[PDB]
TrEMBL record:
Species for this entry: Pseudomonas aeruginosa
One GO molecular-function entry: beta-lactamase activity
Protein name: Beta-lactamase
GO annotation, cellular component aspect: outer membrane-bounded periplasmic space
Ranges in coiled-coil conformation: none
One Pfam family this sequence matches: Beta-lactamase
Gene3D superfamilies given in the database record: DD-peptidase/beta-lactamase superfamily
Chemical reaction(s) catalysed: a beta-lactam + H2O = a substituted beta-amino acid
InterPro entries listed in its UniProt record: AmpC, AmpC-like, AmpC_pseudomonas, Beta-lactam-related, Beta-lactam/transpept-like, Beta-lactam_class-C_AS
Similarity comment: Belongs to the class-C beta-lactamase family.
Length: 360
């Protein structure tokens, strides 16, 4: 009976949304009172008929920001940086720039003063171009005052966290972070031996789309992972105490809220809501206006623990893919939804809300 009821709940949430958004393939993974449950739908590749499984690799886009935040949490645990550091402390090229007056916290939480959603098209994936972009950038408004969701912002946060540890960002993730979290199916650069698992992404007229190189891509949006590995990461977030102590502290650093915008409390990577909350309010917090427009923040007088009666979440998108992760610390409940079409955030949240409501 229980396996039949859980399958009926997840199918009822997923199937109409896959049909309505023409999603070729979708993987669900659920952590429920310490047990994993997987539901796999459709095709990883339409052309070769490869089916989605819990081992299929998807692009998770900005869910990568929670991994970037975890690396910064490790640098914090090691006393190699502090969130109140000026950004230019960690990169001499930025000395004398406006990054002398911008904190690592500002970069991590998109409050540096109007760093845009993307690097401009004039900035290619090239160390000198990225360096020169930051050297010349000037805030539109005071650092710390307005949230503008931004790849160059948290990208530079990750880049500087890696500099504080004295190694390149991609090497630290591969050699230290993924192994510490027990993640063997999680990649910034998918090995040749694993390419057979890499789903195709789909856009307009089913154009094939896998993410191409971009400036600070690894830090902002570069992770490819399976539903099973991403649920292992959610389970690490639900139980940091099970990891070796520096890594427990690194995860805990991603569960601290600094300010509110509407119903959302901003952490490092994770965004949190009170739980329960209406589906419409969870959709609104993950809406296009929240992501694309500047919002004045309401700063907390001290950092707030993102635990208990809360939902922590993150959306992630690339041209071909749409991911969503959510978990409820105080209920030991976690959810991953990975798809190979970039379909609306509101639809991702609709699936998740139906599942989380029915596990409740
Ligand atoms: B992340 O996945 O949130 C980073 N997102 C992006 O770079 C892109 N869109 O950003 C918005 C519109 C905020 C979103 O909802 O993801 C992006 C990259 S390629 C593409 N089609 N969209």
């Amino acid at each position: 009976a229980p396996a039949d009821r859980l399958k009926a709940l997840v199918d009822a949430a997923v199937q109409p949304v896959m049909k309505a958004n023409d999603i070729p393939g979708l993987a669900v993974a659920i952590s429920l009172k310490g047990e994993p449950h997987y539901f796999s739908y459709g095709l990883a590749s339409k052309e070769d008929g490869r089916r989605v499984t819990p081992e299929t690799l998807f692009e998770i886009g900005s869910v990568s920001k929670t991994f970037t935040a975890t690396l910064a949490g490790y640098a914090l645990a090691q006393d190699k940086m502090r969130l109140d550091d000026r950004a230019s402390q960690h990169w001499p090229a930025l000395q004398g720039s406006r990054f002398d007056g911008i904190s690592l916290l500002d970069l991590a939480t998109y409050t540096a003063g109007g760093l845009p959603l993307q690097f401009p098209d004039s900035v290619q994936k090239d160390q000198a171009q990225i360096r020169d972009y930051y050297r010349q950038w000037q805030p539109t408004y005071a650092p710390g005052s307005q949230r503008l969701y931004s790849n160059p912002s948290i990208g530079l946060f990750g880049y500087l966290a890696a500099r504080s540890l004295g190694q390149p960002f991609e090497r630290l993730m591969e050699q230290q972070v993924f192994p510490a979290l027990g993640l063997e199916q999680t990649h910034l650069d998918v090995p040749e031996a694993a390419l057979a698992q890499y789903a195709q992404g789909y856009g307009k007229d089913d154009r094939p789309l896998r993410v191409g190189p971009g400036p600070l891509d690894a830090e902002g949006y570069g992770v490819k992972t399976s539903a099973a590995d991403l649920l292992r990461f959610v389970d690490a977030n639900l139980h940091p105490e099970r990891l070796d102590r520096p890594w427990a502290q690194a995860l805990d650093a991603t569960h601290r809220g600094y300010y509110k915008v509407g119903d959302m409390t901003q952490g490092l990577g994770w965004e949190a809501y009170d739980w329960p909350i209406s589906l419409k309010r969870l959709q609104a917090g993950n809406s296009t206006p929240m992501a694309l427009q500047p919002h004045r923040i309401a700063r907390l007088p001290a950092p707030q623990a993102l635990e208990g009666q809360r939902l922590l979440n993150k959306t992630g998108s690339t041209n071909g893919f749409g991911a969503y992760v959510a978990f409820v610390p105080g209920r030991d409940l976690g959810l991953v939804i990975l798809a190979n079409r970039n379909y609306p955030n509101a639809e991702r949240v609709k699936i998740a809300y139906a599942i989380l409501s029915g596990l409740e």
